[PDB]
Structures are given as structure tokens and as C-alpha cells.
Amino acid sequence: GPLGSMSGGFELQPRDGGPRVALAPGETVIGRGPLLGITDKRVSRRHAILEVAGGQLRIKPIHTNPCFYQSSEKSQLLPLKPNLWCYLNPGDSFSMLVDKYIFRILSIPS
Amino acid sequence: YDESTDE
Ligand SMILES: [Mg+2]
């Protein structure tokens, strides 16, 4: 029959060892601001959107200054396509600059 | 965080 609901939450782990950030259900706009403590003026205050729903995490870059993605299996942060949602797997990383503000996706309970 | 984004 019908599959029903799926749970599962997410946390961001900064590559530089800063504190982890748990994500709320639904959409969270990320970028320069107090949530992640990013202050570099090259990151927009409305840089990307993250969405947690149904046990999945997706990201959408929303600024001309891009976001980057590194699959857990690979070794280079590469640009994400502008303005498109992309699912992120636990263990993957994304970043707000090519070489700074890099976060690994961890799986946690909802 | 009041300053405009650098492009
Ligand atoms: Mg502007």
C-alpha cells in the first residue's frame, strides 16, 4: 500500500572544527549572517537555501556568487548549477566559497 | 552584516 512518512534530520559540520549546526525542518536561508557565523563579504546574506523534508536534504544556490559541492566519494569542490535544487547525501560536503566555509552533512534524528 | 555583498 501507500508508503507513508519518512523521518531523518541533518546537521552541518564545519571543516575547520567550529561547532556543528543542526538544521530545522523545512527551508533555511543560509549565507552571511549569525546562523553560520559567516562574515566574509563575498558570501551573500541570501546565498543559498537548504531544505530538510521527508528525510532528505536539498540545496539551491540563489546568488550569482556560487555554491560548491563535493560528493563524499570525490575530492574536489565543484560549482553547483545556479538556481537549481540538488539533493545532498549524508557525508557529502558543500561550500559557500571554493576554499572556505565548507560543511559536511551529518545525519541525525528528526 | 550590514554591508553589501562583494561581486
Ligand atoms: Mg544585491
Author numbering:
A (entry chain A): -4 to 105
B (entry chain D): 229 to 235
Task: Please quote the authors directly.
Their primary binding targets are casein kinase 2-phosphorylated forms of the XRCC1 and XRCC4 scaffold molecules which respectively coordinate single-stranded and double-stranded DNA break repair pathways. The precise role of APLF is yet to be determined although it does possess both endo- and exo-nuclease activity and its depletion is associated with impairment of NHEJ.
Here, we present the high-resolution X-ray structure of a complex of phosphorylated XRCC4 with APLF, the most divergent of the three FHA domain family members. The final model contains two complexes each comprising residues 1–104 of APLF with an additional five N-terminal-residues derived from the cleaved GST-tag and the bound tri-phosphorylated XRCC4 phosphopeptide. Comparison of the APLF FHA domain structure with those of PNKP and aprataxin shows that, as expected from the relatively high degree of sequence homology, their FHA domain β-sandwich folds are similar overall, although, consistent with sequence comparison, the APLF structure is most divergent and contains a six-residue extension in loop β6–β7. Tyr229 in position pT −4 is held in place by a hydrophobic stacking interaction with Pro29. In accordance with the lack of binding effect associated with phosphorylation of Ser237, only residues pT −4 to pT +2 could be modelled into the electron density, indicating that the C-terminal end of the peptide, including Asp236 at pT +3, and pSer237 at the pT +4 position, is mobile. However, it appears to be in a suitable position for electrostatic recognition of both Glu pT −2, Asp pT +1 and pSer at pT −1 (see below). Interestingly, in the APLF/XRCC4 structure the pT −1 phosphoserine assumes an upright, solvent exposed conformation, making no direct contacts to FHA domain residues.
